[PDB]
C-alpha cells in the first residue's frame, strides 16, 4: 500500500544538497577589442547621411572559469559608438559573478540586472550582460560535452546561409557581381543586397543585375536599413515583387511597427526586421503588432542567449520565420534550435578572432562537433584587445 | 584587417560534424505498473457522485539507454481509467526512438507526434510521450552531471511544500487534525484541505477547525476539485476570505475560463487551477483568459517537461505564480527553475517507487545533489509492474 488512513513521511538518507555541491565561479576576465575594417563599410544609413562609414567593430569579450575546472567564453559588440559603455558597465558589475553557481543562468542574469537597476532592462546595460550570459551558456554546453545547439536541442544539423558582406553600397556594381561569383563558388546559399539609397533607380539597376546573374531560383534578398519612408517602401515593394525575394529587410524605421505590418500585409514578399532592437520587450511589440514575416533578433544586442530564447519562442508561437543578425558564431546554434527553417547571415569579419572556422557546404553552414559555441580565442583577438580587467583568481 | 574590397571565405580545419558524432538511442523499456492505495481516496468528485473512490494509480515508466552509456528514466500516470491507453500508445510509438540523437528532445517529440498524428497533440497521446520526454531530460541533466533543476537553471535550492494527502474528504475531521500535527511535526510548510462536498456547511466547519488548530499564520489552502457552480463558488469565496487562504483551487469546471477569471477578479484571495489540463494549448487559453492567480500544470498530464516549460514561461510572462500538481519527484526541479516563488505539493504515494527520498525541512523540500531527476527505480516498482516491453538492444 502506498497510503494509509493518516499520512506518512519518508526519512532521507542522502542529506547532501545541490546548493552545497554545485560548481562556483572563481574567475572572470573582460576585454574590449576593436576589429579593424580596412575597407570602410557603407549601407543605406551612410548614403542618406545618417551615419559615417564603418571602419571598425568593438568586441567585448567575457571569459569565465569555475572552481571545478570549466570555462566559458562569450561576447557582445558595437558598430559605431557603444563599445566603451558596454565594456565599462560589464566591468562595473562583473564581480557579482564570483561565488555564484554558474548553472543558475537566469538567477545570475537577474542579480546582474539588480546590481545595475538604475540603467534599465534594455539597451546598452543588457548588452553588457550579453558576453557573460553567452559565456555561461558556452560553459554549460561544455559541461555536458555538447555543441551549444545540442544542449538547447537541435531541429537541424546545418543551416541555410546567405552572404551580406559582398553586397554593401560602397561597392561598385561590377565588384558586387564579382563577389557573387566568389561567394557562390564557396557554397553560399543566398545573397543579400543593400538598398535604400537616395537614388532608387540605381538600387533597381543593381538589384536587376544581381538577379540576372544569379538566375531565377537562387535565394536573393534586400536590406534598406530603415532608409525608406512609407510611400517609397510600398512603391519599391511593388516593383521588387518581380524578383521573387526571400525577403525585404528593414524597409522602414526599426520602431515603425504599423508601417512594417502594413507593408507585410500588402506584399506577398516576406518582410523582415529586428536587428536594431535591444530587448525581448522591444521584439515582443513588433511581433504582437504583426510587423514582419521574418524576425531577426541579435543575441548580443538583446541581452544574450537567454532573452534570445524567449524571443525565438514568441516568434514561433506567431508562426514567424527566424533570420538572426550577424554573429553567426552564436546564431548558428540558436537557429539550429528553431522549429521552423531559419536563415543564417554571413560576414567574414569575425573570422580572425577565432582559431576555428565554420564549414560552408552546399548552401548551408554545418554545426561542428566542437563543444559550446565551438570557438577558441586567437592571438589576433588578444592583439586587438585595448582594455582588459579581471576578477577573482584563476583556479 | 577583418575585411576587404571584395569578399573572403576562410577554410575550416576540423571536419567532424555534430550530426556524425552525436550520441544515439539504442534501447528503450516501457513499463505499466499499478500503485495500490489500501485506503480508498475520495475528494469532492466522489462525494458529488461524479466518480468512485480512488484505489490505485497507474504508472507508465520509460527507460532509455544510449550508445555512449547514458541512461534516463521518466514516467507519467493515470488516476482511474487512462493508464492502459497511455502505455499502449507509448508501446506503439517507442520504436521511433531508436537511432535518434537523444539531445534533440523537441525534434524527437515532433517525430513522435507525427508517428501518431491521427490521435492529436493533446490528451492521452501526449501523456504517452511524457515518460519518454521526461526520461530524455533526465538523461541530458545526467550527461551534464547536474540535478535537473541545475541543468534548467535554478532560482532556489529548495521549494515551499504543502501536504494534500492528509486533507481528503473520506477522512473524518479528528483524523484530518491528527494528520496536520504529523505533517507539521515532519516539517511541512502548508496544508491544503479538500472542500466542495454537497454539504457546504460541513466544509466551512472542517475549514474553521483546521485554521483554528494551525493558528492565524500557517499557510492554508483549499481545493474544490471543480465541484461548485458559479453561484456557490462566489458565495463560498466571500465566506472564506476571513481564513486568509493562500489560494482557492479548482472552484469550478476546469474549462470554465470566464467563471474562474470572474472569481479571480472578484476575490482578493488567489484562485488556482490547471491540474486537469492536458496540453500547453489548454493552459494557454486559461492564461490568456486571466483564469487564475496560480497556474497548476502537471508535467505528466501536459505531455512532459518540454511543454511544461513553455507553460511556465507563459505563466511567468503573465505575472502568475506556479504551483505544479502531484509528481513532486519531477515538479521539484521545474518549480525550482520558476522565477516567481512557487509551491510544491506533497503526497507520499510515490515514495515506494524510488530508492531515494526527498528531504523535507523547515517547510521546504530540498533539491539533492543527485543528477537528473535524482531517483532510481526500486525493486517494489518492478514488483508492481504488470506489463512491460523493450525495443533495441542494451548497450
Swiss-Prot record, chains A, B:
InterPro entries listed in its UniProt record: Enolase-like_C_sf, Enolase-like_N, Enolase_C-like, L-talarate_dehydratase, Mandel_Rmase/mucon_lact_enz_CS, Mandelate_racemase_C, Mandelate_racemase_N_dom, RHMD-like
Loss of function: phenotype: Cells lacking this gene lose the ability to grow on L-talarate as carbon source, and are impaired in the ability to utilize galactarate as carbon source.
Residues flagged as site, Increases basicity of active site His: 298
Binding site for substrate: 43-45, 79-80, 192, 225, 345
Cysteine disulfide partners in this protein: none
SUPFAM superfamilies: Enolase C-terminal domain-like, Enolase N-terminal domain-like
Activity regulation text: Competitively inhibited by tartronate.
Residues annotated as the enzyme's active site: 194, 325
Residues annotated to bind Mg(2+): 223, 249, 275
Consequence recorded when altering residue 325 to N/A: Loss of dehydration activity on both L-talarate and galactarate and loss of epimerization activity
Assembly description: Homooctamer; tetramer of dimers.
Family according to the record: Belongs to the mandelate racemase/muconate lactonizing enzyme family.
Protein name, entry field: L-talarate/galactarate dehydratase
Species of the source: Salmonella typhimurium (strain LT2 / SGSC1412 / ATCC 700720)
Upper classification of the organism: Bacteria, Pseudomonadati, Pseudomonadota, Gammaproteobacteria, Enterobacterales
Amino acid at each position: 500500500s502506498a497510503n494509509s488512513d493518516a499520512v506518512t513521511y519518508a526519512k532521507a538518507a542522502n542529506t547532501r544538497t545541490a546548493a552545497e555541491t554545485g560548481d562556483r565561479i572563481e574567475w572572470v576576465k573582460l576585454s574590449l577589442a576593436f576589429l579593424p575594417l580596412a575597407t570602410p563599410v557603407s549601407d543605406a544609413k551612410v548614403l542618406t547621411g545618417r551615419q559615417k562609414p564603418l571602419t571598425e567593430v568593438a568586441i567585448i569579450i567575457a571569459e569565465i572559469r569555475s572552481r571545478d575546472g570549466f570555462e566559458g567564453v562569450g561576447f557582445s559588440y558595437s558598430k559605431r559608438a557603444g563599445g566603451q559603455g558596454i565594456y565599462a558597465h560589464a566591468k562595473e558589475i562583473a564581480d557579482n559573478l564570483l561565488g555564484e553557481d554558474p548553472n543558475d543562468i537566469d538567477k545570475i542574469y537577474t542579480k546582474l540586472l539588480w546590481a545595475g537597476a538604475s540603467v534599465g532592462r534594455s539597451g546598452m546595460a543588457v548588452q553588457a550582460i550579453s558576453p557573460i550570459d553567452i559565456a555561461l551558456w558556452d560553459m554549460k554546453a561544455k559541461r555536458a560535452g555538447l555543441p551549444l545547439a545540442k544542449l538547447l536541442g537541435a531541429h537541424r544539423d546545418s543551416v541555410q546561409c546567405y552572404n551580406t558582406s559582398g553586397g554593401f553600397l560602397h561597392t561598385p556594381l561590377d565588384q558586387v557581381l564579382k563577389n557573387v561569383v566568389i561567394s557562390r563558388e564557396n557554397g553560399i546559399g543566398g545573397i543579400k543586397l543593400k538598398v535604400g539609397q537616395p537614388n532608387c533607380a540605381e538600387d533597381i539597376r543593381r538589384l536587376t543585375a544581381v538577379r540576372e546573374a544569379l538566375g531565377d531560383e537562387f535565394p536573393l534578398m534586400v536590406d534598406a536599413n530603415q532608409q525608406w519612408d512609407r510611400e517609397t517602401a510600398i512603391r519599391m515593394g511593388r516593383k521588387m515583387e518581380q524578383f521573387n525575394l526571400i525577403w525585404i529587410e528593414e524597409p522602414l524605421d526599426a520602431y515603425d511597427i504599423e508601417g512594417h505590418a502594413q507593408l507585410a500585409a500588402a506584399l506577398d514578399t516576406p518582410i523582415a526586421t529586428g536587428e536594431m532592437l535591444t530587448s525581448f520587450r522591444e521584439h515582443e511589440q513588433l511581433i504582437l503588432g504583426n510587423a514582419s514575416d521574418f524576425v531577426q533578433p541579435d543575441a548580443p544586442r538583446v541581452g544574450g542567449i537567454s532573452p534570445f530564447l524567449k524571443i525565438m519562442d514568441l516568434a514561433a508561437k506567431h508562426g514567424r520565420k527566424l533570420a538572426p543578425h550577424f554573429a553567426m558564431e552564436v546564431h548558428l546554434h540558436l537557429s539550429a534550435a528553431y522549429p521552423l527553417e531559419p536563415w543564417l547571415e554571413h560576414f567574414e569579419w569575425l573570422n580572425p578572432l577565432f582559431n576555428e572556422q565554420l564549414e560552408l557546404r552546399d548552401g548551408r553552414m554545418w554545426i561542428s562537433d566542437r563543444h559550446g559555441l565551438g570557438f577558441t580565442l586567437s592571438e589576433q583577438a588578444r592583439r586587438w584587445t585595448q582594455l582588459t580587467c579581471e576578477f577573482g583568481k584563476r583556479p
